[model samples]
Target: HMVSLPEELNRVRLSRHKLERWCHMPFFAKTVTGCFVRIGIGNHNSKPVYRVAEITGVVETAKVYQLGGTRTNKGLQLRHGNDQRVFRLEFVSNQEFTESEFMKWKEAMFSAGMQLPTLDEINKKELSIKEA
Candidate 1:
């Protein structure tokens, strides 16, 4: 009953009803020539998490795509949570976004991964900018 939505239809907002109905369905990322990827929103370690998975195969009974995992594992699965939460599924390339818009997205993702620039890096970049 699940469907694999194409990347071309990126940025569409999904309601809670639609998400639960298509729990295991994959909403692909925006890429022209690469492996198909699905982005799912779920919670990990009691916090919101974003996942990117490469679709390897379809599971008819499970209505999910068999995913490839990290170095030691294989056959992971991508799906929304059972909780009734609506989510925006999309990945826009930098080329399509204005600089400010892209920076907002950049900051959000970096904050999520806790990979923001270190204080030293920030200072160094500030000095570089002042010199320029």
Candidate 2:
């Protein structure tokens, strides 16, 4: 059997709490949060790019703040240096990965009988092979 890491080491590392929060599913104990990326809208697009911004305060409306920008009860304003442009927001979660499963994808077009057929292809080609 594989040995588990020490309590302190495991706690300091990518713990379950972080994974659950990132995956947004905390019910499954065996659920491992895999690597993922968050895609947000850019400027000039019809959809407004929405991201988690820090809330400063609130008045009639809510308050939010970010780099080179600030939001208040009134509206958002870019200070001086920053300017709005078309860009995508990407956030990487601090998740750990061990030996993960690999998937084989077909790329280039193969010459006839050049490459061996996969189990799936063989099944499709031959009537003897049952299709699942």
Candidate 3:
């Protein structure tokens, strides 16, 4: 069983850095903390490496951050961004950096289908304003 997915496959890459805090967990409609999640981050060699992180959760109104239909054309470019209530996660453990079982937990969360989430910019304004 071999399927190598790109680091961009999901927002996990961006999520790892906390630059973009929101993630889609539609069924998880409540606040959750210390949740172990699989993510990709910079390794010792400065390459994308997968790891586990216990994210500090938050809930907020945010656009979907994925490649699927519901998440298409998202971001601050609200011209087409599909904003919704989503989970905003941040921070990590106060524990050690090397742990086997935790990494296992991270790997368990890996799914190629979640990869390289949204957005497209053609650099053109929407017709609503262009009509003027």
Candidate 4:
């Protein structure tokens, strides 16, 4: 059991009162919402955490779309700064998702050694580009 910060922490840290300050903040949960599953590794409070997110919005393109091959240099930088070789994969189709389908996609993705996004990112927002 690895517990650090709770989900509510986001609500607290990102208070409604601060909306004015955070508007156009460049990063909103809306940026990552969608009907997708992704896994990722990060450290919260100095502890290593492994989890997944369901992309909810299209604040930015899918990591697949922005990816740069070895020809460019070293790859993906998912944090605020470190923008490197990543692809922002977009799904441009109106569709519904089910648990089984999600699980299959999840498994296939991780099995391919791809990094996963946070689960909170999942929603109905479709991407403008897609993976190859």
Q: Which candidate is the best by TM-score?
A: 3
Per-prediction TM-score: 0.21, 0.15, 0.28, 0.24
- Tens-place lDDT per residue, model 2, 11-108, is 22223233333332332222221111111324445743322111121122253322123222222111111222222112212333221100110111
- Order the candidates by TM-score, highest first — what do you get? 3, 4, 1, 2
Model 3, residue 20: what's the lDDT? 31
Give lDDT for model 1. 0.31
User: How would you encode candidate 4's per-residue C-alpha lDDT over 1-132 as one tens digit per residue?
Assistant: 211233311221222123222223454343333322223344679964332233333333323221222111111222211211232321111223334434554565556665544424211133221220
- Name the 10 consecutive residues with the lowest summed lDDT in model 3: 75-84
Question: Better model by TM-score, 1 or 4?
Answer: 4
**lDDT of each residue in 53-128, candidate 1, tens digit only:** 2223322332333222211111223322221222232221112223343344345445555343334543443344
Total clashing residue pairs per candidate?
0, 0, 5, 35
**CA shift of 97, model 4, Å:** 1.3
Tell me the deviation in Å of residue 86 in model 2.
22
lDDT of 3 at 29: 22
Model 2 lDDT, residue 122, Cα: 27
Off by over 4 Å in 4: 1-91, 119-132
The local lDDT score (0 to 100) that residue 69 gets in candidate 4 is 22
